[PDB]
Structures are given as C-alpha cells and as structure tokens.
C-alpha cells in the first residue's frame with residue numbers, strides 16, 4: 001500500500017526485528033528494518049535537532065542529530081529516491097509508543113524543496129517553516145493522536161493533562177501541499193528538512209521513537225503500527 | 238459569499254462601472270469598483286512583471302507593474318487586511334475575456350508569507366516559486382478554463398490550438414495550501430507576491446485583465462463573472 | 475561627516491535633548507533628536523527582539539520591539555531614504571554607556587536587502603544571518619569596545635570578567651560588505667532587519683541604549699559619542 | 712601561495728597537461744590537472760547555467776552544467792574541503808583567453824552558504840544574488856581585465872567595443888565578504904552556487920574557459936596564468 005522512506009530516531013532497541021542494542025538513528029527504505037543505522041546517545045528530557053538532506057546528483061540520504069553541548073550522530077545511505085518514491089509526495093513526522101512510552105513533542109519544523117530545470121534560471125521551490133503550532137493549523141494534516149496548540153507545540157502522541165505520555169499511541173502530521181520531487185526536465189532536485197524535538201519519559205526505557213518520512217500523497221497510518229512500527233509500517237518485514 | 242481582496246491589471250476601460258478611460262492597475266477590496274487605480278501603459282505582446290507587497294505594521298497594500306525598458310506604474314492603498322479577510326486564506330491568480338479577448342498567460346509566480354510572533358525568533362513562513370508549470374501540477378487548484386503545461390506556462394483563459402485567445406472565458410489557479418495571515422501572538426505579518434505575465438491580443442481592444450487575489454479558502458468562480466468581473470465578483474456593485 | 479539613519483532602543487531619558495520621560499524606541503534621521511518615538515516598556519535582564527522594515531514604494535521606516543509574554547512597542551516614520559543616504563551603505567549595530575551603564579549584548583542578527591529592477595526577474599539580493607558570533611568573525615567590522623565570541627555573543631560595550639557592564643563605553647559592529655540600496659533601474663528596493671538583544675544592568679537606571687543603523691560605508695565612531703549619543707552622533711543637535 | 716578549489720568549464724583541450732580531447736567540466740583541487748572531468752558539449756553563443764553543490768556530511772563536490780533543450784553534463788568528486796581550504800575563504804569566478812579566445816560573460820550569479828551548529832536552531836547563513844551588475848559594483852573585488860556594467864553583465868576577460876573577445880586576457884571577480892566554511896561547533900556546513908554564462912567566439916576553437924573557485928581570502932591572479940591556467944594556477948603542475 002504506502003511507499004515510505006523515513007529517517008527514524010528510534011529510542012527502543014527491538015533486536016528481534018534488527019535494531020541494534022541501543023537508541024539509534026536509521027534510514028528506512030520501505031521497511032522498518034533500517035538499511036543503515038548509527039548509535040544515538042539519546043538524552044531524556046533534552047531538546048534535540050535533526051537535519052536531513054538529499055539531492056538527486058549524489059543520491060545519498062544523510063541525517064545528523066545533535067543535542068546542545070554534545071557530539072552529534074550522523075547516518076548516510078546511497079539511494080536513488082526517483083526509483084523508490086512517486087514524483088509527487090507528502091512529507092511528514094510520525095511517532096508512536098507501545099507498552100513503553102515517551103512524549104514525542106515537536107517544537108519547530110522547516111522544509112525546503114528545490115527543482116532546478118535546464119531552462120536558464122527555471123527554479124521551482126517550496127519552503128515552509130513552523131516555529132509555533134496553533135490549535136487549528138489548517139496547513140497540516142494530523143492523523144491518529146497528533147494534536148497542535150498545546151504550549152504552541154505539536155504533540156505527535158497522546159499526553160494526558162498532567163504532562164504524562166500515554167502508551168499504545170500513534171500520530172502523524174503531514175504538510176498539506178504535495179511536494180514535487182522529480183520532473184522530466186530537472187537537472188538537480190534537492191530537499192533539506194530540520195526539526196527540533198523533546199522526547200521525555202518518566203521511565204528508564206522510553207519507546208518508541210520519532211521519524212521524519214516522505215510518502216505517497218494519500219498515505220494514512222497502517223492498522224496496528226503503534227509501538228515498534230512507528231506509525232509507518234504495517235508489519236516488521 | 239466570498240471575501241476578495243485583489244490587485245487587478247485591467248486591460249479594458251468599463252467606464253460605466255467606474256474604470257478610468259485607459260488600462261489601469263487597481264486595488265479591489267470586496268468590489269470590482271477599485272478603491273484606487275493608476276494608469277497602466279499596457280504593452281500588447283510583451284512580458285510584464287507585477288510585484289505586490291503588504292505588512293501588518295503599515296497596513297498599506299502596494300503593487301508595482303513594469304515592462305522591460307519602460308517606466309513602471311504603481312498604486313497603493315491603506316487598508317488593514319485583518320479587518321477584511323479571515324486569518325486563513327488561499328492566494329491565487331484570476332483572469333477573464335468577454336466580447337473582447339486576450340491570452341492571460343502566466344510564465345512564473347512566487348509568493349512569500351511571514352508571521353513573526355513575540356516569542357524570541359518565532360517565525361512561521363511559507364514560500365513557493367514556480368518558474369515552470371507542468372500538466373499535472375498537484376499543488377495548484379485550477380478552476381474554470383485555466384490549464385498548465387502548455388509550453389510550461391499557466392494559461393488562465395482558453396486559447397485555441399493556433400494560439401488564439403477565446404472570448405467569454407474565465408479561469409483561476411490557487412496555491413493548494415491555506416496561508417496563515419493573522420495569529421494572536423504575531424507582532425508583524427507580511428507577504429510579497431511576484432508574477433510575470435504575457436497578455437497578447439490580435440485586436441486593438443484587449444479585454445479583460447488579470448488579477449492577483451486573496452480569498453476565503455473555499456472561494457470558487459462566481460456565476461457569470463466572465464468579462465469585466467474578472468472571475469472574482471458576482472456583480473458590479 | 476557621516477550620514478546616519480538609525481532606529482534607537484533608548485534606555486535612558488535625556489529630556490534636555492528631547493527624549494520623552496521613559497525608555498523609548500525612536501527613528502533618528504541624521505540627529506539624536508528622534509523624529510518619532512514610542513514608549514518602550516524595557517525589561518532589565520530579559521531577551522528582546524527588534525524588527526525593522528522599509529521599502530522604496532511606501533517610503534516608511536517602521537520598527538517593532540517585543541519581549542516574550544509582553545505586548546510590543548512599534549514606531550513608524552515616513553521618510554524617503556534615497557533622499558538621505560548614499561546608494562551604497564553599510565548596516566550595523568551600535569551601543570553605549572556613560573555615567574549609567576548596562577550590558578548591550580546581541581545574541582543574533584539577520585538582514586535581508588532586495589533590489590528588484592524592471593528587467594523581467596532581475597532581483598539582486600543580499601542576506602546574512604548570525605545566530606552565533608565567533609572570536610574572529612571576519613565578516614564583521616568591529617569598532618570601539620565591541621567584541622565577539624564571549625559565550626558566542628556579540629558584546630557591543632565593555633563588560634568586565636565578572637559579567638559587569640562598564641560605564642563610558644562605545645562599540646559598533648558593521649557587516650563587512652557594502653549594501654546596494656538604490657540603482658537607476660530598480661522598481662522596488664526593500665530591507666528587513668531583525669536582532670535579539672539582552673540589556674542587563676545592576677542599577678535601577680540603565681543607560682544608554684542600542685541602535686540599528688545604516689550609514690555611509692566608511693562611517694567610524696564620532697569622538698565623544700559615549701553616553702547619550704549612542705556611538706552615532708558627534709553632538710546633540 | 713594560494714589554495715584553490717575550482718570547478719572549471721574548460722573550452723580548450725590541452726592534452727599535454729591532462730585535459731581530455733574535448734571541452735569538459737572538471738574539479739580542480741590545487742592543480743589545473745583536474746581530479747575528475749566529464750565531457751561537456753559546449754554551445755558557442757548560447758547561454759548556459761552551472762550549479763555547484765557541496766556539504767560537509769557527504770564531502771562530495773558536484774557540478775551540473777546545462778544549456779536549454781539539451782542534456783546536461785555532471786561531474787562529482789569526493790573531497791573533504793576542511794582538509795584543503797582555510798575556515799574563512801572568498802568565492803569567485805575566473806576566466807582567461809590565450810592565443811585562442813572567447814567572451815567569458817556572466818549574466819547572473821548566486822551563492823548560499825550555511826553553517827548549522829549544535830546549539831538548537833543556530834544557523835549562520837550568507838546569501839547573495841546578482842541578476843544584474845552595475846559599473847561600480849562595490850561588493851565585488853574585480854581583478855585583472857574583469858569589468859561590470861556593460862549591458863549590466865560581468866565581463867571576465869577583455870572584449871573590444873565591436874563585441875570582439877581579445878586574446879591573452881585574464882580577469883576574476885570575488886564577492887567582497889569572507890565566507891565562513893568551518894567552525895568548531897558546526898554539525899553541517901553546506902554551499903550552493905549557480906551562475907549563467909555566455910561563451911561566444913568568432914573561431915572554431917574557443918579558449919580557455921570559465922571557473923567558479925574558492926580560495927584563501929587574499930588570493931590574487933598568479934603571474935602568467937592567462938591561457939590554459941585559467942587565471943587560477945601559477946603553473947601546470
């Protein structure tokens with residue numbers, strides 16, 4: 001059904017489906033079983049920043065995640081996205097909790113997409129930046145338990161009144177407009193995405209993670225994708 | 238029904254509904270009868286550029302239109318748009334022909350919107366730029382006779398195969414995503430729009446014009462708004 | 475000698491040279507005696523944000539200053555800058571202390587300048603953004619007591635080791651490259667500047683203020699402009 | 712003496728110093744003998760566009776050159792620029808003619824540089840765009856025979872009144888402000904440059920080419936670098 005390309009910030013090690021034995025960042029190409037991962041020294045309760053870049057000349061999806069005063073983690077994977085995704089896609093953020101939980105709060109999110117064609121100066125571009133989310137954010141499609149406006153933040157999974165994260169939750173937020181990522185006369189297509197997040201758990205084992213993803217425009221949350229499947233995949237294949 | 242704020246590039250003088258006796262640029266606030274106009278030395282067959290700017294501190298909508306090697310025309314009007322429009326709007330381009338006609342071709346269009354709130358650095362922004370339109374432009378809502386892809390251009394009104402403009406035509410193109418133009422904690426909201434066009438008529442009296450407009454998100458073409466009403470207003474009141 | 479256009483964030487009321495009896499924001503056109511001022515509820519020790527905008531169609535210089543959780547102050551003045559400044563200028567930040575003092579710390583500064591000419595799509599632009607200053611910032615010209623790198627901030631006036639502001643200090647920082655603000659074929663010239671600051675004093679009466687300014691490219695600090703003259707004017711005329 | 716990293720658009724095949732037997736685009740790292748080249752189907756008298764991209768996560772310098780209605784040429788090379796260049800550099804365009812000649816006209820040039828550090832949202836950026844050059848362009852350092860203003864274009868090598876290119880010419884234009892390309896707390900540094908050019912020769916064998924380059928801030932034209940050395944290298948080593 002959906003075609004998903006995602007960069008996951010995976011907080012819980014599910015070693016039975018291929019995760020390493022630690023928090024990690026990974027690049028998922030149509031499967032929760034990451035094609036490449038890197039150890040991520042996740043900091044509970046601290047605001048982090050994730051940067052994702054890609055361009056059609058090099059065909060390498062790379063992501064860098066860091067916390068203030070700390071060294072960053074980075075992961076890269078050679079993949080030609082024109083061979084994986086459709087030419088029109090929607091970009092979004094997804095997150096889940098299962099038996100273990102954590103808040104999956106997004107404080108800001110920016111995305112820039114550029115298609116430069118061969119006609120002298122023909123640049124088509126799309127850029128959006130949210131540094132504050134309001135209760136009725138009409139340019140975002142919120143799916144599942146995701147909500148906006150609480151402290152001007154985007155809460156991808158359920159948090160009850162007293163600030164506590166709830167288990168078995170799943171929510172996604174996609175930018176309203178389709179994004180054009182390939183066109184026959186384009187000589188270079190590129191995108192850059194940045195988002196700051198705050199993962200906080202009252203427990204020693206937070207779960208499950210946050211993922212930036214790109215999908216077919218009509219993507220919806222697969223049934224049963226709470227927990228380890230990050231609201232993105234229908235199974236662990 | 239719709240709330241329309243528009244900058245018109247009016248090619249035909251309908252003196253019975255208040256137009257001056259020449260081509261002109263005007264600022265229309267919920268009525269085809271422009272609140273302010275300026276003489277426009279329209280050049281048949283030449284590519285022109287229109288720039289529209291506005292910000293919530295000054296509350297002045299201003300537009301400048303020019304052709305290469307020619308002096309420009311400019312018109313300004315003091316209007317507080319928070320008192321006219323909703324906080325969520327869609328922006329677009331509209332054009333029509335009636336008994337007289339002209340092609341209403343758009344070669345490029347860019348728009349930037351910014352809402353800066355009082356939280357240190359809280360800037361929400363939206364920017365899109367089209368320098369080429371493809372046949373299935375999924376991020377544009379095309380209404381009426383508007384079509385994209387012909388020579389990579391956006392044709393707002395019908396043009397038959399041999400390049401000829403057809404009379405009694407009306408078409409509009411709106412960017413897919415809603416635009417947020419007011420928010421309770423914003424200290425300055427501003428937008429800037431730019432578009433290049435090519436109006437060409439085989440006749441001495443081209444009609445009717447092109448207009449950049451901002452409307453309620455669900456705006457559609459009013460019945461009978463071909464001709465002098467520019468695909469924007471239901472009557473000449 | 476220099477031609478100065480500045481937006482001042484004046485913390486000390488010098489009623490003998492025309493200040494109102496409170497902290498205020500003012501627009502200074504070649505004189506410390508502001509052409510227009512607005513009361514500013516200055517918050518000692520809090521990080522504030524100042525936004526300055528202007529465009530050649532409207533000819534209105536406007537500034538908005540705000541603190542988180544507080545209402546903002548705004549001041550506007552109709553002035554045609556092509557009649558005041560040269561076509562090539564340098565932009566900068568200035569600050570001083572006299573018998574009373576305060577820290578004049580800049581945490582970030584961005585500036586965007588655009589000159590759109592009548593040649594279809596001819597846009598010349600300049601944009602810089604500093605969210606962190608390093609000890610050897612080669613793209614800034616630092617004058618007087620200004621220094622960069624201390625906590626990644628720009629300190630316009632002297633602060634001694636223990637974090638204390640020193641009196642009788644004056645410092646300015648200008649972006650290295652000249653900025654083009656007028657050109658014969660330009661149909662609209664515009665700029666936007668934003669900077670966040672932290673004014674902190676151990677005293678009940680902080681002095682003297684911070685100012686964003688635009689000057690002739692070779693501007694230097696006038697002799698004796700500590701205190702009330704903000705490192706910008708040679709006298710109080 | 713200078714440290715040069717350059718992308719050359721080489722119009723003349725000097726097979727004795729390693730050029731292939733055709734026009735080509737190459738990546739030069741401190742030597743005119745390109746580390747990697749790709750065949751370039753150069754079109755005499757047509758306006759072309761060159762795009763150069765690089766980021767510190769991937770460490771790959773890539774360039775794409777194309778002409779309207781034609782397939783593009785692309786070349787890539789894995790190189791860590793932090794190991795080659797200083798942290799502060801100047802970027803520019805260079806061109807030369809020797810016994811064979813061609814005009815080396817630049818019609819537009821844009822550059823964007825970004826340093827994202829690990830402090831949440833700490834983005835330092837620099838962007839400039841020239842779509843028109845004036846006779847006294849104060850933000851450009853012109854070296855050798857380079858001049859601006861002729862038809863609003865930048866002429867890197869001498870062209871006599873009647874529009875004819877002169878042999879044995881060399882000229883360079885660098886943006887005035889230093890560019891910061893590395894900083895100790897940066898997690899991703901990236902740049903993108905774009906320029907459109909018009910190479911025209913009355914002869915069947917045009918020479919010598921145009922190059923986009925990055926150098927130490929005080930770089931000047933090496934003695935005797937007309938011809939095959941592109942105004943960049945002192946010898947053919």
Ligand SMILES: [Ca+2]
Nearest residue numbers: 010012013014
């Ligand atoms: Ca997992």
Ligand SMILES: [Ca+2]
Nearest residue numbers: 247249250251
């Ligand atoms: Ca009319």
Ligand SMILES: [Ca+2]
Nearest residue numbers: 484486487488
């Ligand atoms: Ca004062």
Ligand SMILES: [Ca+2]
Nearest residue numbers: 721723724725
């Ligand atoms: Ca050669």
Ligand code: NI
Nearest residue numbers: 010019026034
């Ligand atoms: Ni994983």
Ligand code: NI
Nearest residue numbers: 247256263271
């Ligand atoms: Ni009219």
Ligand code: NI
Nearest residue numbers: 484493500508
């Ligand atoms: Ni004052």
Ligand code: NI
Nearest residue numbers: 721730737745
């Ligand atoms: Ni070569």
